[PDB]
Design a protein around this ligand. Structure first.
Ligand SMILES: Nc1ncnc2c1ncn2[C@@H]1O[C@H](COP(=O)(O)OP(=O)(O)O)[C@@H](O)[C@H]1O
Ligand SMILES: [Mg+2]
Lengths: 446, 584, 454
């Protein structure tokens, strides 16, 4: 039945009723069984890509059967505490899950008017986030990183320290590793076990040397499990995905297999659609208990904010968390630069009844003072740094203490929202009361 | 049995019909000359063949015969201290047989010596149940490497007969009583290079490799089983970096692959290495070195074969329990070979013409390195450290090869042309370079040196980072515009680069620096900034500190030359430097 | 034997398509007999089924399709090599240009040649005294090395190359270099410069010329270097002569290589140049060195003009990745009257270490080189600071190095195109320059050498 075997691809004749992205099964001449996926289908033939590759396949004495169904996920409540493949296969030497049902990994499209206002506060335990760029339930808050930047530890710290206060009913964390090395993959899987965070999390681990079609199926596999736990089990689900850059690169390979002309910067034209189709599988829904919160993580090529991957993402997600090379070289952990970072829904998760009543003001105070203190340091370098204003001098020492003490908290240090706000006041206590943007009734926190 | 018929010859690409019984990734002999080639595509009875030799004088109508086996390597004694080409052919033997100083075509020679007598030493008892990876005996191939005869994959049974003696790699040395009947083993086994050798599991590389290079061992360390890339312009020092590592490493065995580079560079290694001494053992370097050579004017397709031949041999000694370091110089020529073949097959081009599966091919290669648990009941531990060079066009690191590489490697040694034209070697850009092991290695270095070393390195980069930020302001204004605090930061930052980072590889003493020496050398540099910072804080002038500490600098700037066994002289400076300022 | 075909299918620029053929091999030399009797040659680029794609060296201008035949000679492009080649001038395809007799060839050798076995190679050890301080001392040339010159349009790379071939000599018994010259798309005046120079020195009597000029076909420029290198390796490894190969312009070779790749509609690399540009140049420059047990050698000094004076351009960039160093000329030094205008900062020699020292040149060779280089780099940085900012901004230690770099260019690098300095005179001149610098700042020279010399 097999007509051609070109590299990782395959041409199969006698196709009838074969659908796009339908799974196939190959029985080789020696009895080895491999599976594949339809990338392109015509009346006379169909193009498929084998998961296990095409090396050592005899064209003459091999047979192929079509399964009549695409990639599916065996969903169940027993997924909690389990580590899976990029294809949803058990990766942790545990018992096979008895499925409640089998679902499509493409999911459904949420109605734009079916969404609720982002409401609750998610304590990531990191001061740079919770205070200045607050994560809210249902929000899509991404992390923009670069080659060599410690986004690995940041992903591990968030997935470990993230909690919902005070209501702790059905909170889960779905982690998706996409096309990363084994070291980075093992680091995550080990950290989830040692800390006990595995007991409430679901993992889908995909490696760099896995075929590009598996890398593409990985985010769809994880999000399907998440929306299952969210909508059908009413769980508060937080989803973390890295690296999203690997996902975009995988698309280029498949697009070239179908011989599609590359778009801007070498990526397929439908890159915008694909990212949006993944990321917009989140947010609170009217008439649904559970929800999906996403933290997509990506590395910007050449640290370029104008690159398609971070540029398109910003048009989809409500803000971003920036990691800079400057702060990393300074020893700041995490190296979060608060000036270019943003959370567009932070006010929806702060105030009173959530966090504390002094959240918003100190945030605006710390932000204004850090920016001004950062500027005063520039004047010091060019001027004598000896005749600068007495008030300005404190601002410079404030900006330094803000980066080394406040932002640089560590990758294994968990701060409650109260501890974060209290430390903010001790930093604001360096300046006189005449230089604040907080109200006079904020003399209860000094 | 089935004889193909060439219908097209275009460069290293050859197509033939009547090949319906052939298979993908199988080797075949092309044309009347019968040159070595590999099948990469199959369209019914027509196969597309990638040839690893010159296709000149070959045309349609000529026969093509399939071997039925994939591109493989002979694994056994007679592999160390040897130089093979891309497809593992002994170049010294090739010279003898062909009676030529040049490279011919269509000549097939066994990879190893099948006539040389080795002494096999049976170390396992008869009646022992064994499987893949188990040791049945060994051959003392070199003074450094003990070649352990392992049970080949796909073999399981009970050792019936075995004894010591002088055998060749073809003689049966052991009889295994398997399920399919009786099987006899030899000292040599075959293995396909495109398939990674099986293991029990992978581990985390947490043991830092001692390269003897200050800039590497300190700020951008690579662990045993790690993966490092060295991108840079021509003449930046990639080959030297890989040579320094190949001769001063902490590993047991070194595999150097000359991928599409100069022939003289390969000749130079063969000549000098036997004269040099292994850090670990004390014997000659050539006793732990395997050389694979496919030069730039040698067949282009053979560049890819050279890469997979090297990593397969590396995996072979890895399963024995050795720590292997493989050098790819350079991986860019590998990518060029793929681009050439991709164009011949008329595929869809990626960035700069490279295949859209380039990043996947690179991923396959680097994921075959690392610290693993080898197969076998012993559950022994081995590792592979990949040190690859990247050769971007014009020095532009935003090129396809470099960018795809930095997504799978963990260490990035970026070479700067501006430093190379300053006699600043190695030309590693401390601002753009990085290492994902820096934190983990730091804690290891702390425990192994019993000092606050991790805090020193962090402090070290903080100064260099501050210097770059300061140099923007220095660009506009003079030397008498910055504060005494700012001026001190620049004087101690220049010390880090000149006293520590710069390292001459052609100097008998400076070519290597022990882990112990790097500690004491860096401490006297940071002590300078600290004791001077304290001086400035109590009223002392920056200038007064400069002309008052001239003789002290000379001792620090000379500390990189002080003999390993006389390390006290560097440590003594720390008291002297603090007392030199204490004089005033 | 073989036969001629009247089945030409199409003529498109430099390419010809022949149909209904058999026994045609890859890279096979062909001949094209036109209707007027004129003969043009070419080689097979691609062959499949009954078809064949060839490139025509002389071009397809004036060719009538219906009344022209094509011969397949059954062998690749060869060169009739002899020792009678010495003193003769040939054109781009190895044919007599000096109106002399036809060479009676000893044999015919495929011009692509073969790759030297890395084991059979003998590492270049023997220091070559070119007499040029900027080379002998800082970027040392060794017998068997491929050391090119990176120049530009209007820069005296011709004078520099002529000076080397006129002054190059080892310090041992042999004082005999056989010069193989390959002209590639150069002008008549540039060609006449070498001709007149070789004639006045008498080097013409011991040299072999392969001349392809600007009025000559561009596609011939692809075979011209291989023609010369085949002759070079022949006289060296079969006759035992120490061959010095001069090639110019290398840029014209890449342009011709780009014409064919464009006509064949191949997928371009950077700036339109073929993906195999590196490998193709490598089949030329790797053709050099020594062989164990054999006397004689092949020393290459290729010449290319960097487009837009840009080193990052594919032609000089990939060349630097291939050759063992490069001697770069710049316009800033040529305008300053520096002869030769060598900028040593981007210059390099990858074989200088094991060609100098004690026993060869002098014990202070390596130390003086690194010290002069570093100080020169520091001075040039000081001069730039004196340009953007005032002279007042320069410290006392900055003015000393700035003046060092100035005198380094005027008295050391600038020696003249006809002055032959010995290695001792060069090294002695190096110490007189280092004397301008404080002894405390000589951090690349140990006290042993620092006390012995000034
Ligand atoms: N660590 C080093 N110490 C001393 N010299 C060096 C060092 N690295 C490079 N060099 C010099 O720079 C040149 C470039 O060497 P090489 O490694 O061949 O360049 P590439 O980057 O093209 O491989 C060498 O000839 C050598 O003299
Ligand atoms: Mg190199």
């Amino acid at each position: 039945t097999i007509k051609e075997v070109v590299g990782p691809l395959m041409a199969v004749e006698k196709v009838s009723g074969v659908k796009y992205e339908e799974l196939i099964e190959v029985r080789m001449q020696n009895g080895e069984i491999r599976r594949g996926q339809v990338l392109e289908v015509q009346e006379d033939k169909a193009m498929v890509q084998i998961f296990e590759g095409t090396s050592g396949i005899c064209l003459k004495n091999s047979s192929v059967r079509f399964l009549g169904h695409p990639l599916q996920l065996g969903v169940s409540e027993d997924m909690i505490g389990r580590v899976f493949d990029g294809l949803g296969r058990p990766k942790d030497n545990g018992p096979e899950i008895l499925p409640e049902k089998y679902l499509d990994i493409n999911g459904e499209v949420i109605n734009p008017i079916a969404r609720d206002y982002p409401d609750e506060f998610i304590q990531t335990g990191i001061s740079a986030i919770d205070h200045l760029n607050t994560l809210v339930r249902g929000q899509k808050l991404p992390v923009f990183s670069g080659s060599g930047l410690p986004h690995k530890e940041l992903a591990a710290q968030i997935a470990r320290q993230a909690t919902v206060l005070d209501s702790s009913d059905d909170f889960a964390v779905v982690f998706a590793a996409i096309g990363i090395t084994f070291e980075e993959a093992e680091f995550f899987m080990e950290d989830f076990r040692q800390t006990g965070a595995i007991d409430r999390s679901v993992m889908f681990m995909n490696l760099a040397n896995d075929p590009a079609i598996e890398r593409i199926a990985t985010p769809r596999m994880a999000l399907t499990a998440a929306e299952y736990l969210a909508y059908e089990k009413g769980m508060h689900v937080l989803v973390i995905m890295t690296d999203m850059t690997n996902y975009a690169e995988a698309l280029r390979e498949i697009s070239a297999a179908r011989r599609e002309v590359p778009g801007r910067r070498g990526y397929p034209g439908y890159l915008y659609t694909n990212l949006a189709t993944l990321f917009e599988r989140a947010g609170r829904i009217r008439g649904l208990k559970g929800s999906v919160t996403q933290i997509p993580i990506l590395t910007m090529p050449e640290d370029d904010k104008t690159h398609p991957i971070p540029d398109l993402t910003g048009y989809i997600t409500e803000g971003q968390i920036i990691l800079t090379r400057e702060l990393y070289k300074s020893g700041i952990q995490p190296p979060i630069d608060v000036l270019p970072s943003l959370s567009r829904l932070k006010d929806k998760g702060t105030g009173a009844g959530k966090t504390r009543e002094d959240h918003a003001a100190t945030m605006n105070q710390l932000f204004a003072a850090y920016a001004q203190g950062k500027q005063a340091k520039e004047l010091a370098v060019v001027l004598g740094e000896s005749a600068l204003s007495d008030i300005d001098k404190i601002y410079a020492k404030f900006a330094e203490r803000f980066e080394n003490e406040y932002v640089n908290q560590g990758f294994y240090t968990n701060r409650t929202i109260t501890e974060t706000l209290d430390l903010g006041w001790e930093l604001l206590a360096m300046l006189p009361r005449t230089e604040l943007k907080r109200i006079k009734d904020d003399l209860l926190d000094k | 049995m089935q004889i193909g018929k060439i219908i097209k010859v275009s460069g290293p690409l050859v197509m033939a019909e009547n090949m319906s019984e052939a298979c993908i990734q199988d080797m075949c002999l092309v044309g009347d000359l019968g040159v070595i080639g590999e099948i990469i595509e199959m369209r019914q009875d027509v196969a597309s063949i990638q040839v690893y030799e010159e296709t000149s004088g070959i045309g349609p109508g000529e026969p093509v015969r399939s071997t039925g086996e994939a591109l493989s390597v002979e694994l056994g004694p007679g592999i160390i201290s040897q130089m093979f080409d891309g497809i593992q052919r002994p170049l010294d033997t090739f010279m003898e047989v062909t009676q030529s100083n040049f490279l011919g075509r269509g000549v097939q020679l066994p990879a190893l010596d099948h006539e040389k007598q080795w002494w096999f030493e049976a170390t396992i008892e008869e009646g022992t149940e064994v499987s893949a990876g188990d040791i049945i005996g060994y051959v003392d191939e070199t003074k450094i490497i003990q070649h352990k005869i392992m049970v080949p994959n796909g073999i399981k049974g009970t050792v019936q007969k075995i004894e010591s003696g002088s055998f060749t790699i073809d003689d049966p040395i052991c009889v295994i009583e398997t399920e399919q009947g009786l099987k006899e083993l030899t000292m040599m086994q075959k293995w396909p290079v495109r398939r990674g050798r099986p293991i029990k599991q992978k581990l985390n590389p947490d043991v830092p490799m001692i390269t003897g290079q200050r800039v590497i061992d300190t700020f951008f360390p690579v662990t045993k089983g790690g993966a490092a890339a060295v991108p840079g312009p021509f003449g930046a020092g990639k080959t030297v970096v890989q040579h320094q590592i190949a001769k001063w490493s902490d590993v047991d065995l070194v595999v150097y692959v000359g991928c599409g580079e100069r022939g003289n560079e390969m000749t130079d290694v063969v000549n000098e290495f036997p004269e040099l001494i292994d850090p670990n053992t004390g014997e000659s370097l050539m006793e732990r070195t395997v050389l694979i050579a496919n030069t730039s004017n040698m067949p282009v397709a053979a560049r890819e074969a050279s890469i997979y031949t090297g990593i397969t041999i590396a995996e072979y000694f890895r399963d024995m329990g050795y720590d292997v370091a493989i050098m790819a110089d350079s991986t860019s020529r590998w990518a060029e070979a793929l681009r050439e073949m991709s164009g011949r097959l008329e595929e869809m081009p990626g960035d700069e013409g490279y295949p859209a599966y380039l990043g996947s091919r690179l991923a396959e290669y680097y994921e075959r390195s690392g610290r693993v648990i080898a197969l076998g009941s012993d559950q022994r531990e081995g590792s592979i450290t990949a040190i690859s060079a990247v050769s971007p066009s014009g020095g532009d690191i935003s090129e396809p090869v470099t960018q795809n590489t930095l997504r799978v490697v963990k260490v990035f040694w970026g070479l700067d042309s501006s430093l190379a034209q300053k006699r600043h070697f190695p030309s590693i850009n401390w601002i753009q370079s990085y290492s994902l092991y820096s934190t983990e290695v730091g804690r290891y270095m702390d425990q192994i040196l019993q000092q606050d070393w991790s805090d020193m390195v962090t402090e070290g980069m903080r100064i260099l980072q501050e210097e770059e930020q300061l140099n923007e302001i220095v660009r506009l204004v003079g030397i008498d515009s910055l504060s005494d605090n700012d001026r001190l930061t620049l004087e101690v930052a220049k010390s880090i680069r000149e006293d520590y980072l710069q390292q001459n590889a052609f100097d008998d003493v400076d070519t290597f620096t022990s882990r112990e020496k790097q500690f004491n050398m860096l401490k006297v540099i940071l002590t300078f900034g600290k004791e001077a910072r304290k001086a400035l804080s109590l009223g002392a002038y920056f200038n007064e500190i400069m002309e008052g500490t001239v003789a002290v600098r000379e001792r620090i700037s000379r500390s990189k030359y002080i003999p390993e066994e006389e390390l006290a002289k560097i440590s003594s400076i720390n008291e002297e430097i603090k007392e030199t300022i204490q004089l005033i």
